[PDB]
DNA sequence: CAAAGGCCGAGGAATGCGCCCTTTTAGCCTTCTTTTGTCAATGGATTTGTG
């Protein structure tokens, strides 16, 4: 994602600064994403969504 | 000898105002190549199982 910096870098571009070939970049991706998912981790993440 | 009237011009609303044809320009619309995000394999290095 695009935080803290001016870009947005892509799944190669990312995966080079971890030496992955984008497949393993994507399953950290998945993994921070699922592990965020959780609630007593993102309550308050859950009250930023507006619904 | 003047007066009526015919003439022209100087000033305004507006019920007033192009069409047909050639030629470029924009943009949408499809078709294809490439960067990118994804699913599944397939070992391989810690984590646990064991006594």
């Given at each position: 994602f695009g935080i803290?910096?001016?870009?947005?870098?892509?799944?190669?571009?990312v995966g080079?600064?971890?030496d992955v070939?984008?497949?393993?970049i994507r399953q950290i991706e998945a993994k921070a994403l699922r592990k965020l998912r959780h609630p007593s981790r993102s309550e308050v993440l859950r009250s930023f969504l507006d619904d």
């Open positions: 803290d910096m001016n870009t947005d870098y892509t799944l190669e571009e080079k600064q971890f070939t984008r497949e393993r």
